[PDB]
Design a protein around this ligand. Structure first.
Ligand code: C14
Ligand code: C14
Ligand code: C14
Ligand code: OCT
Lengths: 240, 240, 447, 144, 156, 96, 48
């Protein structure tokens, strides 16, 4: 069976089912992948300085390495042994009840004040006669720091005090999920579990992954090293 | 219609009087956006960018497009006119025109130069037969390999006609020479003449393949251009 | 046009450009397709292209009425224009490829430096490229510079106090000023879109922001000025990315005399001196022509090895092959003189033109050597005797083909190209009839 | 509609780019995000790659990433096309008597001319330079 | 703006010191406005070019020139953390209590982005700490909303 | 769903049909829009055509129309698959 | 193998009686104990 055709047929049928799926499941991104059941190689990532936590290493791999390895031809599936960071709002139910608020009010406030608005332009098309200037209007942009999420105004009291999001929750960067924790010879690590795409060559794909990692190595932070704890390709190369 | 959009009810006031969309907004048919202002010699303009279908004919499609536009003439509003600011058809015609010229032109001059030296109309026809046979043969090999009639294959075929003329002269001249210097009959003179050059002609086919074939084994854009000249010339030369 | 330049201004330039072409080039120009709004560096109100359609080749006689000539004249007259950077340029031979001369450089933000820091790292490379006119020329950014934009902050406290939802505020703003696609309707049996937007004269200047009213929860109509506060700042009207990461495309070419390969090697050296977390990659033609370079010597090597081996089997000799293969420069040099004298360029047509001349001069030599060698083998003749008999027997057919060629080419004597392959074959024939006899005797004496 | 270069990049460009994974024979992926409220993401592939397979693989990974884009972009929709602007020819349509705007010309071409040129023998693709009509509601803030 | 005035704005914005110095010699308008009302001093102050700020002020550039929304160069310098340009501007007679159309002072902007040293220099040159924006918010109110205790200690 | 033949044809069928221009080895294209809401555009290809590539090339050209379609039509989802006109067999089921 | 799981029933009458929404009850429960993906933000140039 041509795997490229098999994927197109499977996805054609999935596309009919996609809108029937819950709203939350679609936003997590449904993925259709053709690959081997097991791993080609694992690309381990450790910090020899100790200036980065196990959380920090996983976040760097996700944001600065994974996407490029996932795009590499011959790579069927990439598995992050860890999790990319997310703006974690840790709600306190005592503090929420104290100001008569719910998780609903927290969710409404974030959607309202972490907005990327399309506000249009000054002197936009079609303009009037003898128009002077043409400039983009910049309204609200996405929040960038934990401190900005901190000062999200939830409500204003009768006396004139303000309830901020930092008053009813602990706000920090942290894994989208906290399920996967990797360790290389005791010391903490992240890594990419790379599966070989259906039909693609093992050795040629391995070379292309190394080639892409080599382009990143120069731009690593302090004491971030790559390690190869699992690789099937060296056996193939030497046995031949 | 604009009337229907105008009569959209926004509000009903306390007294019973109405507020419609037309009362708070101008309504008209217009463009989706007003970013572009297209003009053709300071006159309002639009257009159609047309692309050729896979395995189609640039000359037939072009003529067919002009035929369809000509039958829309009587249905156009007042002031509307068709213009052709860009067209690749002119260049395709010329690429074919030069090949037909070079063939006709070649067959004439070979006939003259064959008669100027050998001085008999019987010998002058043998080039006139062989050159057309090989060119028609070349078109069949281009079709088999799955090439098109384009500038690169045709200006490569122009250079090929030069090689075809030689193979015609080399054979006939050597028979006429062997007949002159030994006084042999046409049949035995040919057997001896071919016996002298047959090993060399096979040799030349390999040597010119060695020159022209590796040109086609370049990668990417350059390789694609080089393949057009390579397959045309090697095919034409090998058939000769 | 510069930053904050309107659509009405860009048209006035395009009007003067079209006025020039239909006036001062009425003999050459057929039409001008003036497109305000679009550009090949970026889009917006402050950009435009003019597609100039010319008349037939016949109606434009001489080199003065060709594109290259009209282009240089056009750019001079448009240098006069006040608040614009206007210049004409010919279309590339193959529209499908693009410019297809010089290099295409991608400068990459490799470690989340941001927009404002990559802007400076680019300016540091541009400044360095300017200090090597001998190697690099026309090193420029292929994108728009940062422009003024109207930052407007919604006071969340004031909006909540007056009882105004942010949804209503951002929608009122985005729909009025930006325009909002609502739903589809059917105009005469065809599906078409419905856009709500502010009438032009209420969405032009910052003074107009104050004229927009959002209804509060209590019922009051709150003006936009009550809960808004605005200032000026600089942001990019066209952000670029390459392989996921932020980038800036830099175009350029090798300086006259220098190869495009050298120019790239310097650009690589200059790039290695930029701030940390700033990488680079080669895209487009630079990616293509770097793949070509590696292959070239391997394919040249195979060509000669196969030629040698094929001649070796033909003649049953390791040495005699060389007598044929030495004819290559004799076919080549004629074309090179014809090119340099008349002023042609070494292009892909000319290159395949050389290969055919080499091929046909080799063809002539292969028979001369074959006849010469056979006379020595069969009839037991001497070296000089056999060579002299060979070149005599082969003189007529070589001159017959060569006469047919120069008679076939001289209708072109369009005059410029007419001497190219004409001169290439004249020397190829003249030299080969004298030099091939030499090559055979010199080789068979030594080996 | 009415989006700045940054808004487009942060909400659309980065989201689609992040989902372009497991696609065969990719060389590089350049993208532009400008203040006309537009994004273009060009995926260039290895030479000899089946351009039909290369397009459907890109088309498929976008469709699963469509729920991640904003409401306004999903509504507008996103198009995937093969990139070879090698046109056979460009037919210009003009108005001499000055009875028609470019809006009126484009709409006529779209309604009557375009579909007929598309069905014409040996025509691979047709592209209208300009858009057909749209119902424009020009709001008045003083009246509102 | 003049023909030269345009090249001074581009040069002042860029940071090309030599080009400005020659345009000062050729008598380029030091008070040449942008489309939005930014003088070369605004552009130099915003993008942080100390050399050009000093050279422009030397050639009689207006230190209290304001854009179409009432923002002086001191706003731009204070807001974006350009310490030694705030010093130079205040020394050459910049209005430390300059209100834009929103009633925002340089002290407000410096406090908001949390540039502690600039806030002290502004206060030293007599910045009004009790000054309010259109909403009625002091530089102190901005510090407690951001939760900057270091900044909150100073502003009183 | 719940749209007459005319409205279904004007908003879906024509929008899809007018982008099915220039597909490799396309002989003819029969289509129909009914009062139930259904569209069924059938593209029949030249004998010997690779049916899998034929499917792919239709799916590519369909995604030009997909953005222009109504919101509810996209919610129901649009299928692109190789078809056959006749039933091989009918398998009846009864209760005795 | 099967494991103990905390079954929780929502009395619809008592909810309607007090005037509490059912969506508010399920969101509050789902968000707090499970986690709610609200929207995206920009962490040093990247969407997260
Ligand atoms: C669109 C592609 C069509 C292919 C046309 C091929 C025609 C072949 C006929 C000649 C065969 C000669 C074999 C040597
Ligand atoms: C029977 C003919 C005797 C003369 C032999 C000539 C052999 C020429 C063949 C050259 C081609 C080499 C193939 C690799
Ligand atoms: C006998 C030589 C044959 C070699 C085949 C390749 C020819 C075309 C390559 C031209 C490269 C020139 C670069 C300026
Ligand atoms: C591959 C070339 C071999 C040459 C050998 C020469 C024998 C004297």
């Amino acid at each position: 069976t041509d795997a490229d055709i098999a994927q197109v047929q499977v996805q054609n049928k999935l596309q009919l089912a996609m809108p029937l799926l819950p709203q939350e499941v679609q936003q997590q991104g449904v993925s259709v992948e053709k690959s081997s059941s097991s791993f080609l190689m694992v690309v381990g990532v450790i910090n020899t300085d100790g200036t980065m936590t196990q959380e920090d290493i996983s976040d760097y791999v996700a944001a600065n390495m994974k996407d490029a390895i996932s795009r590499t031809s011959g790579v069927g599936d990439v598995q992050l042994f860890g999790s990319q960071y997310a703006m974690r709002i840790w709600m306190n139910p005592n503090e929420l009840n104290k100001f008569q608020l719910t998780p609903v009010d927290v969710i409404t406030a974030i959607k309202a004040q972490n907005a990327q608005v399309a506000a249009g332009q000054l002197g936009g098309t079609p303009p009037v006669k003898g128009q002077q200037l043409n400039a983009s209007i910049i309204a609200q942009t996405r929040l960038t720091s934990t401190e900005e999420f901190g000062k999200i105004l939830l409500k204003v009291n009768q006396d004139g005090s303000r309830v901020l999001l930092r008053d009813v929750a602990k706000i920090e960067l942290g894994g989208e999920n906290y399920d996967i924790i990797a360790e290389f010879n005791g010391q903490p690590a992240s890594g990419l579990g790379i599966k070989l795409a259906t039909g693609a060559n093992a050795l040629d794909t391995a070379a292309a992954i190394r080639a892409e990692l080599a382009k990143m190595e120069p731009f690593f932070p302090s004491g971030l090293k790559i390690v190869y704890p699992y690789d099937t390709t060296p056996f193939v190369k030497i046995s031949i | 219609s604009t009337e229907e959009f105008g009569k959209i009810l926004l509000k009903v006031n306390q007294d019973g009087s109405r507020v419609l969309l037309r009362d708070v907004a101008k309504i008209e048919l217009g463009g989706e956006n007003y970013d572009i202002i297209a003009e053709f010699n300071g006159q309002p303009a639009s257009g159609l960018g047309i692309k050729l279908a896979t395995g189609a004919n640039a000359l037939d499609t072009a003529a067919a497009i002009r035929a369809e536009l000509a039958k829309m003439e009587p249905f156009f509003p007042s002031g509307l006119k068709i213009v052709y600011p860009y067209d690749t058809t002119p260049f395709v015609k010329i690429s074919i025109h030069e090949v037909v010229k070079t063939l006709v032109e070649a067959i004439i001059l070979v006939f003259l130069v064959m008669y100027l030296f050998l001085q008999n109309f019987r010998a002058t026809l043998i080039p006139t037969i062989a050159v057309p046979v090989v060119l028609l043969g070349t078109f069949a090999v281009l079709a088999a390999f799955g090439f098109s009639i384009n500038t690169l294959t045709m200006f490569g075929m122009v250079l090929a006609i030069g090689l075809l003329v030689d193979d015609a002269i080399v054979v006939v001249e050597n028979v006429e020479r062997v007949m002159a210097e030994e006084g042999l009959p046409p049949k035995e003179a040919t057997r001896k003449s071919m016996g002298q050059i047959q090993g060399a002609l096979v040799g030349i086919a390999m040597v010119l393949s060695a020159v022209f074939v590796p040109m086609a084994f370049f990668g990417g854009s350059t390789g694609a251009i080089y393949r057009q000249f390579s397959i045309t010339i090697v095919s034409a030369m090998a058939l000769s | 046009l510069p930053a904050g330049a309107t659509q009405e201004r860009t048209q006035k330039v395009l009007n003067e450009v079209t006025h020039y072409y239909l006036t001062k080039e009425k003999n050459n120009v057929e039409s001008v397709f003036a497109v305000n709004g679009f550009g090949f560096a970026g889009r917006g109100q402050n950009t435009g292209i003019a597609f100039v359609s010319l008349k037939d080749w016949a109606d434009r006689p001489g080199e003065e009425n060709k594109v290259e000539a009209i282009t240089m004249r056009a750019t001079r007259a448009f240098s006069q224009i006040k608040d614009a950077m206007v210049f004409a340029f010919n279309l590339p031979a193959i529209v499908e490829l693009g410019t297809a001369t010089g290099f295409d450089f991608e400068l990459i933000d490799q470690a989340g430096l941001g927009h404002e820091k990559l802007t400076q790292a680019r300016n540091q490379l541009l400044a360095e490229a300017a200090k090597h006119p001998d190697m690099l020329t026309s090193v420029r950014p292929n994108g728009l510079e940062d422009t003024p934009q109207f930052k407007i902050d919604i006071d969340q406290e004031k909006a909540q106090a007056l009882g105004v939802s942010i949804n209503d505020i951002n929608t009122t703003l985005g729909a009025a000023w930006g325009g909002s696609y609502v739903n589809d309707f059917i105009d005469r049996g065809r599906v078409k879109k419905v856009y709500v937007m502010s009438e032009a004269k209420y969405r032009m200047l910052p003074d107009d922001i104050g004229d927009w009213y959002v209804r509060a929860a209590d019922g009051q109509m709150v003006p936009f000025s009550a809960f808004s506060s605005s200032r000026w700042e600089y942001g990019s009207p066209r952000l670029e990315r390459y392989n996921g990461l932020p980038s800036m495309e830099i175009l350029g070419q090798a300086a006259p005399g220098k190869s495009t390969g050298e120019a790239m090697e310097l650009m690589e050296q200059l790039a290695s001196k930029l701030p940390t977390g700033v990488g680079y990659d080669w895209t487009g033609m630079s990616y293509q022509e770097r793949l070509s370079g590696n292959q070239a010597p391997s394919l040249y090597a195979i060509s000669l090895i196969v030629v040698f081996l094929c001649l070796a089997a033909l003649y049953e000799s390791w040495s005699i092959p060389f007598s044929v293969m030495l004819v290559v420069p004799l076919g080549v040099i004629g074309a090179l003189l014809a090119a340099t004298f008349r002023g042609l360029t070494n292009d892909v047509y000319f290159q395949v033109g050389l290969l055919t001349t080499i091929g046909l001069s080799a063809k002539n030599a292969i028979l001369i050597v074959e006849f010469a060698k056979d006379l020595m083998d069969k009839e037991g003749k001497g070296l000089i005797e056999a060579t002299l008999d060979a070149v005599r027997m082969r003189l007529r057919p070589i001159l017959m083909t060569s006469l047919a060629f120069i008679l076939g080419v001289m209708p072109l004597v369009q005059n410029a190209v007419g001497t190219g392959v004409m001169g290439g074959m004249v020397t190829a024939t003249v030299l080969a009839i004298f030099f091939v006899p030499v090559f055979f005797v010199v080789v068979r004496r030594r080996f | 509609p009415g989006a700045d270069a940054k808004t487009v990049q942060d909400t659309v460009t980065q989201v689609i780019e992040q989902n372009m994974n497991g696609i065969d024979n990719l060389m590089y992926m350049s993208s532009n995000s400008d203040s006309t409220g537009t994004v273009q993401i060009t995926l260039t592939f290895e030479s000899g790659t089946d351009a039909d397979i290369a397009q459907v693989q890109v088309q498929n990974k976008l469709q699963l990433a469509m729920p991640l884009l904003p409401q306004e972009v999903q509504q507008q929709g996103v198009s995937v096309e093969k990139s070879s602007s090698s046109f056979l020819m460009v037919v210009g349509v003009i108005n001499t008597d000055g009875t028609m705007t470019q809006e009126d010309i484009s709409d006529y071409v779209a309604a009557n001319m375009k579909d007929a040129i598309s069905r014409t023998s040996g025509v691979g693709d047709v592209q209208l330079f300009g858009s057909q009509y749209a119902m424009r509601i020009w709001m008045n803030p003083n009246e509102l | 703006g003049s023909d030269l005035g345009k090249k001074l704005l581009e040069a002042a914005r860029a940071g090309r010191d030599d080009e400005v110095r020659i345009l000062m010699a050729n008598g380029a308008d030091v008070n040449a406005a942008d489309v939005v009302g930014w003088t070369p001093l605004h552009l130099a102050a915003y993008w942080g070019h100390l050399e050009i700020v000093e050279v422009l002020l030397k050639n009689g550039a207006d230190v209290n020139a304001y854009d179409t929304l009432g923002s002086t160069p001191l706003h731009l310098a204070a807001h974006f953390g350009h310490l030694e340009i705030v010093e130079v501007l205040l020394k050459n007679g910049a209005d430390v209590n300059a209100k834009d159309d929103n009633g925002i002072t340089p002290l407000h902007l410096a406090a908001n982005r949390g540039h502690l040293e600039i806030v002290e220099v502004l206060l030293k040159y007599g910045a009004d700490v009790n000054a309010q924006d259109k909403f009625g918010k002091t530089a102190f109110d901005i510090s407690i909303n951001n939760g900057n205790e270091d900044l909150a200690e100073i502003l009183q």
